[PDB]
Design a protein around this ligand. Structure first.
Ligand SMILES: NC(=O)CC[C@H](N)C(=O)O
Ligand SMILES: NC(=O)CC[C@H](N)C(=O)O
Ligand SMILES: NC(=O)CC[C@H](N)C(=O)O
Ligand SMILES: NC(=O)CC[C@H](N)C(=O)O
Ligand SMILES: NC(=O)CC[C@H](N)C(=O)O
Ligand SMILES: NC(=O)CC[C@H](N)C(=O)O
Ligand SMILES: NC(=O)CC[C@H](N)C(=O)O
Ligand SMILES: NC(=O)CC[C@H](N)C(=O)O
Ligand SMILES: [Mg+2]
Ligand SMILES: [Mg+2]
Ligand SMILES: [Mg+2]
Ligand SMILES: [Mg+2]
Lengths: 150, 150, 150, 150, 150, 150, 150, 150
């Protein structure tokens, strides 16, 4: 990757429906070169794909939660817990972090009941779980994971 | 929105570069109808946009952090702190949550130094900040915010 | 339910011994209509019943406690713990909450000894209990659960 | 108060619409005596009143919260904070407790937004508040404050 | 007990070697009456005994500790843990408290090593112990348990 | 101090009303020598005094508390807070400890109200107090501060 | 050891490559005496050895961590855990401390991955480990363990 | 640096008094080459110096402490606090860490009093200090900071 690729990415991260002609004009380079570079980037796996950004509200995803999960130590309990957490419907993010040396789980649901039946009940039944603490998100000030280049 | 729109969205959330002809075939509907519905969805704001999914590693974003920030109570300190946190370069997520009744901030950087100079030093200088606790992410088990329909 | 029912409820929540004639006069409607609506409300279960508000002091309920209980994860331990907690004499409130993802138990007793023998000893013997933390209430600034309409 | 008064209270705490004739029959005493005793109890303030028990769901009170509030020490900050908390619409319970030596606040709202605008924003603006931690109630296993005699 | 007994106790709590003649003079009562009352108090168990107040430093008791111990719930673990803690040489105080709903243990030793071998190693070997947290006392601002009447 | 003095102290710590003749017989030494040594010990300050051990219950000291107090840092706030805490009526013990690097305060009162008016209200008014956490003692398994030699 | 030995040590702790002639001149004593004393010190074990102070950065030791480890109580679990922690490659410091009554482990690694594979995975597999909390060091303000005499 | 330099360092980190002839023999290289490389390493700053390893006990450094210090946010308070902490006599280590986002301070003293007068009193007087928590080290299982190559 070079300076050029960055500018391309800085644009595609925001809007992938920006016609080549428009991008070519902005960064001032041959449309055929651009097309080539974009292919290169995908080939190499820099650009892993293109997604539609859907508004969660539009799907009535009102119950937003961030849960910290502490795992029981020993055997392979840790790694196993992470994967079990990542497959729960509604969970889009699972991170293993230092500090509380545990998992941080991001999930979304339409209501409390859905949350309870799909997430909580499942979680409370997992043996490797020592403890879980759920923080209800009451306001999303910002959520732009797509923005990787500032 | 109806059952049909969902199926369309369930596909566009994963891959927006799926030609209409291919989608039309999968959900079995006229390509012109599909195109219409997709336009409708954008018009109404269900689909807010299309992004390129860029691999963070490809940009050497190695220092991943999740920080909890407690704000000083009173005046308008809270709301103000959230916005100041959302404009720090590298920060893609800011949530106000219950429980610790504070902010959860998601950010990414290439290194510790970058993290320190761009995020920490800035944060430690904000007056409204009572306390901040940063959790270093050592492993991303899953990060698919794009998946809103399971 | 309509605007009218609300006004009726806003009155019955405070004082259920308010003669129909008096209520009819306040909200200005036929006493027979009122009587009908009140019946409707009970029928439908909006009004689940009428109680006598007894002063706890009058019964020497001096030892007031609020206990947080953490449950051991797995099996059905959680749901089971809640019900065991709800049947302890003296306990009038059991809530399963997020954050500490545990139970909050409200209870009243005449003395420390009663508290110990009826609540604590029972609680400490429950297997599913991981930990319990009791907060002694030294002052009730307000306790009006009956007020549902402000 | 004597053994008799207790039996009367043990009944009125559950259902105050139980005709004198029915109560008189249960406890086996003259209806005129009963009526006298009940008056005595009210006179003396044992029975402070009769309320209608309204189902919160019936009023769409879905967002149930239990908040711990720590106050800034000094002056009269403490006592003042308690009263300010007790007058927030939606708050039915305020207790000053030992342990975390702070306040426990019980409140109910129809939604998150209502909760935010009526409770949180108000609370975050109170100067005497050092910190507040809100626990969202996801399940009410039991709530019978009316039951004072077991 | 009456007003007189109090004055007697308020003196004996400070200095038990105060001749009857001196006390009799201070509270102005017959020495024979005093002697009688003091006997009464012992008889009834108000005065459980007379001790020599020994300076801990004089015995090189330099390592002063206050330890909080959390017990594993269930069976009779709790009560059993308390008694095991009360028999450890060096431990003069064991309290079961609310809040952290655990034990607070007061002990004294001449050195760190003594502390380790007599207290810690013993404690760490007790099964019923979930966790222990020792707070080293660096300064005794006041220690007058003998003063019960202010 | 020598081996002999210890044996003397090991006895006087338990019961100071043990006639010289009895002690002389137990440790097998001349009564005049004993009397001399005891004087020496007092002279040198090993034995600081003799107290009457009064049963707290006998004085209706039912509300027993152990409070942790965190002080605001800076100036001389710390040392000042300790002394203010040591002069509150009912407080018999004040320790400055490491770990939570704060104060541990032991106090006794007859009731909750007394506790509130004499201890809490006073404490909450002290400026240097950052935070206080009171643990109610529900059971004294052991309290023998007089025993310094095991 | 005497005043002289101290001055010698105060120099050797900083720079052991300081020729005898130079030291002899600084402390003003016969070079043969100095040489003798230094030998004495080693003989007696005051000086346990001489090391080369290597800059960690020079070895790309970028991932610096400080981990608190809580051990499961009972048997000999504690002592055993300490030794297992002290033999993990990268760990240069293991301390058993009071307060959290646990272990504090100091370690260094070149990267996150190394840290994970050599330290974390090993630690998470140890049975006696109740919980571990890793604090990432982002800045070393000072690290001069060699300085024992100020 | 190359493979050779490592072997040299792996030896000098343990014992710097190992004659060149001995090292030359172990790693099998010309003594003149070795001498050259060692000079290179110092020149480049890989080897920053040679120290005498002094046994702390030999200096009666019995009171070993590890203190966590939280700083007040804002201005330049943080950076300033670190430097003030690094200049306190007895302090050999100051680290700024994530998690509790604070300072970890390592210090040694001969006694509690020294600790109090030199470290604590100084620390409690620093304004930028929000809170400090000292953990007394009761056992050093391992302390070999000199070992950088395993
Ligand atoms: N720069 C452009 O947009 C087009 C350049 C050139 N004609 C090409 O398409 O290869
Ligand atoms: N279903 C299709 O793919 C095409 C249908 C129809 N010929 C249209 O394009 O409107
Ligand atoms: N409004 C009243 O109080 C009475 C109205 C009418 N006479 C009725 O009883 O039905
Ligand atoms: N016991 C009753 O119900 C009635 C008793 C008696 N006739 C009265 O009313 O005074
Ligand atoms: N008051 C005294 O000291 C002595 C009173 C009286 N002579 C008695 O001893 O009984
Ligand atoms: N040993 C005793 O009790 C008395 C010894 C000796 N006659 C004395 O009193 O000095
Ligand atoms: N003081 C010195 O440096 C040397 C003293 C004396 N000539 C010796 O070497 O023993
Ligand atoms: N290898 C050695 O120890 C010595 C090698 C060679 N004679 C030199 O000193 O340069
Ligand atoms: Mg995207
Ligand atoms: Mg009611
Ligand atoms: Mg005494
Ligand atoms: Mg060294």
């Amino acid at each position: 990757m070079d300076e050029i690729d960055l500018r391309i990415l800085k644009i595609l991260q925001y809007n992938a429906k920006y016609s080549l002609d428009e991008i070519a004009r902005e960064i001032r380079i041959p449309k055929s070169t651009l097309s080539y570079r974009i292919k290169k980037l995908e080939k190499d796996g820099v650009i892993k794909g293109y997604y539609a950004y859907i508004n969660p509200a539009s799907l009535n995803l009102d119950y937003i939660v961030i849960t910290s999960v502490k795992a029981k130590y020993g055997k392979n309990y840790h790694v196993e817990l992470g994967n079990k957490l990542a497959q729960i419907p509604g969970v889009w993010g699972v991170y293993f972090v230092l500090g509380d040396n545990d998992f941080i789980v991001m999930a979304r649901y339409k209501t409390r009941e859905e949350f309870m039946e799909k997430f909580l009940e499942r979680v409370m039944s997992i043996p490797e779980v020592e403890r879980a603490s759920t923080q209800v998100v009451v306001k999303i000030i910002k959520e732009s994971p797509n923005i990787v280049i500032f």
